[PDB]
Amino acid sequence: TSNALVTGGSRGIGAASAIKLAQEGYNVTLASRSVDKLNEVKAKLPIVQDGQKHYIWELDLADVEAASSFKGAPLPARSYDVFVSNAGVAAFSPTADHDDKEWQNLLAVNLSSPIALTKALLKDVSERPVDKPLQIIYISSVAGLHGAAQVAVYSASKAGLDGFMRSVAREVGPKGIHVNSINPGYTKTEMTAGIEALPDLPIKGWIEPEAIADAVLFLAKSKNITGTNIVVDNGLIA
Amino acid sequence: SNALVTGGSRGIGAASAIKLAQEGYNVTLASRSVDKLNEVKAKLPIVQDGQKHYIWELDLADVEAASSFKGAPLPARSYDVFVSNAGVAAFSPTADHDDKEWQNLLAVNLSSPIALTKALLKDVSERPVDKPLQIIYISSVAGLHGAAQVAVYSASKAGLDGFMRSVAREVGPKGIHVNSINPGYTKTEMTAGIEALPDLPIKGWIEPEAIADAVLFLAKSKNITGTNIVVDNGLIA
Numbered sequence: 109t110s111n112a113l114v115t116g117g118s119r120g121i122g123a124a125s126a127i128k129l130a131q132e133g134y135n136v137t138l139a140s141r142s143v144d145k146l147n148e149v150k151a152k153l154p155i156v157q158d159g160q161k162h163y164i165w166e167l168d169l170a171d172v173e174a175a176s177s178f179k180g181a182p183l184p185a186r187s188y189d190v191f192v193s194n195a196g197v198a199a200f201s202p203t204a205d206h207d208d209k210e211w212q213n214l215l216a217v218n219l220s221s222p223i224a225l226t227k228a229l230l231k232d233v234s235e236r237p238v239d240k241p242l243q244i245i246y247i248s249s250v251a252g253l254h255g256a257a258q259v260a261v262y263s264a265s266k267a268g269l270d271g272f273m274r275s276v277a278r279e280v281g282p283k284g285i286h287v288n289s290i291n292p293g294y295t296k297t298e299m300t301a302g303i304e305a306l307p308d309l310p311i312k313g314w315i316e317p318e319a320i321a322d323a324v325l326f327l328a329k330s331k332n333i334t335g336t337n338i339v340v341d342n343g344l345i346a
Numbered sequence: 347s348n349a350l351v352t353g354g355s356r357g358i359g360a361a362s363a364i365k366l367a368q369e370g371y372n373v374t375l376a377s378r379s380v381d382k383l384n385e386v387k388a389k390l391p392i393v394q395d396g397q398k399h400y401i402w403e404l405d406l407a408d409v410e411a412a413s414s415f416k417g418a419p420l421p422a423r424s425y426d427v428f429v430s431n432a433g434v435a436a437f438s439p440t441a442d443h444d445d446k447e448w449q450n451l452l453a454v455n456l457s458s459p460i461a462l463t464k465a466l467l468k469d470v471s472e473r474p475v476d477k478p479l480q481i482i483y484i485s486s487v488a489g490l491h492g493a494a495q496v497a498v499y500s501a502s503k504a505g506l507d508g509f510m511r512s513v514a515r516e517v518g519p520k521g522i523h524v525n526s527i528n529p530g531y532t533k534t535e536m537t538a539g540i541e542a543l544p545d546l547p548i549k550g551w552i553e554p555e556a557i558a559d560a561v562l563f564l565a566k567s568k569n570i571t572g573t574n575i576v577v578d579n580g581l582i583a
């Protein structure tokens with residue numbers, strides 16, 4: 109069996125990534141706060157091989173100690189072959205006005221919980237064989253790569269995740285653990301539904317979540333990629 | 347007029363405070379250590395009539411203290427230069443790094459700088475042309491490339507830089523310019539434990555005064571915002 113953990117599996121990029129991973133034969137564990145929405149995604153996931161099975165994990169990533177301990181998880185951390193750290197929350201505000209508890213919670217969900225989950229996986233896995241590396245894939249953002257007004261703390265969270273990624277990649281490559289970020293541009297999901305007009309881009313229009321999922325698959329099957337960013341942004345930052 | 351330097355008690359911050367005071371700024375030194383802050387304060391040049399220096403006992407593990415300028419000798423709007431210098435380092439295998447420890451590191455290195463920044467932005471008078479407010483983060487090359495066993499440290503410094511770029515775009519039109527300096531291996535108490543250097547293009551340790559020269563270049567600048575000034579002896583070239 110192969111197992112993939114997708115946080116934020118209840119909709120958007122995570123749901124799309126989960127579907128594609130299940131089509132490739134992975135047992136997928138969907139993790140988020142919403143049991144009913146998780147179950148609905150679970151019901152749509154492909155089955156491509158007998159014995160394949162999917163799981164849900166009720167997990168609030170505002171709770172960093174739960175992440176750290178894999179609290180409630182259906183399988184031990186060492187069972188996973190792919191970890192798609194996809195859960196995140198956005199916030200649009202003048203920096204002067206952004207409520208302190210709101211921006212601190214954003215950091216906990218976007219940066220501290222991924223850190224804690226990664227630590228828990230590294231501890232349990234310890235090392236991997238050369239034929240079956242563990243792939244850790246952060247869903248970061250182009251906001252971590254260039255400055256956009258009124259998304260400062262969000263940008264901090266994503267740039268921070270990418271900085272963690274490069275250091276972990278160098279540390280654990282010799283253990284057979286490969287670690288990368290995908291940095292999406294404007295992608296049509298619940299998170300960006302409040303945006304009513306896009307910037308003028310070299311490739312026009314919204315990106316679909318399924319397009320980000322194809323980049324997850326590219327990394328999940330990869331062999332010689334670690335410590336890098338895969339930017340899927342319609343040319344926003346070119 | 348006024349410069350705020352967090353982590354003013356030693357190292358890069360102390361050297362930066364000395365150079366800013368040489369330039370005529372009234373310097374506020376902030377850190378946890380009132381006695382060491384007073385020792386540095388006594389060494390700060392006085393070069394201009396009416397010039398005055400201050401200390402501020404501030405623990406950046408307390409993010410709400412930062413956010414409210416708790417205990418500050420001057421309001422946030424009085425500052426013309428903000429050197430966000432305080433920071434802490436930690437070395438560990440990621441798998442074994444104590445949760446309270448790495449969370450406290452994020453608070454000191456990232457969340458408190460964000461909070462001090464928000465306080466300054468909220469209080470400031472939009473700035474005249476020849477007197478922009480300069481915000482200068484002391485980040486690290488660790489935030490630009492991957493080094494093993496400093497993962498959460500690297501996350502803090504990369505996060506600081508991502509914050510910096512977004513704030514720069516946002517507040518430039520208010521006359522507020524915002525940049526990071528990313529040092530390499532510098533001779534301070536932070537590095538006294540870890541001595542063999544890598545094989546560098548420019549050999550040897552960097553002096554804290556050398557970082558302070560970069561602070562002064564930014565403090566006097568006019569057309570720089572959203573960027574990184576890398577002073578690293580060629581480590582990352």
Ligand SMILES: NC(=O)c1ccc[n+]([C@@H]2O[C@H](COP(=O)([O-])OP(=O)(O)OC[C@H]3O[C@@H](n4cnc5c(N)ncnc54)[C@H](OP(=O)(O)O)[C@@H]3O)[C@@H](O)[C@H]2O)c1
Pocket residue numbers: 115116117118119120121122139140141142145167168169170193194195196197198217247248249250291292293294295296297298299300317
């Ligand atoms: N859409 C874009 O334009 C775009 C661009 C760049 C990057 N991203 C990144 O893409 C990732 C996925 O976002 P999305 O665009 O697919 O938006 P989305 O459809 O709103 O998905 C957000 C996901 O995160 C989960 N989540 C949020 N807060 C959580 C918490 N406290 N604990 C557990 N799970 C939580 C949500 O599940 P529950 O609500 O069920 O808990 C949901 O499954 C995010 O990391 C985001 O920053 C998005």
Ligand SMILES: NC(=O)c1ccc[n+]([C@@H]2O[C@H](COP(=O)([O-])OP(=O)(O)OC[C@H]3O[C@@H](n4cnc5c(N)ncnc54)[C@H](OP(=O)(O)O)[C@@H]3O)[C@@H](O)[C@H]2O)c1
Pocket residue numbers: 352353354355356357358359376377378379382404405406407431432433434435454484485486487528529530531532533534535536537
């Ligand atoms: N040295 C290097 O090679 C190097 C390289 C890259 C970046 N840096 C960065 O340079 C900055 C300055 O460090 P340094 O090398 O000059 O080290 P240092 O001499 O040890 O100085 C660190 C300063 O930070 C203050 N600080 C630490 N924790 C604090 C807290 N909780 N509240 C308030 N102040 C606190 C310390 O003052 P108290 O102890 O008095 O509170 C001290 O003044 C740091 O941000 C560091 O990450 C250093």
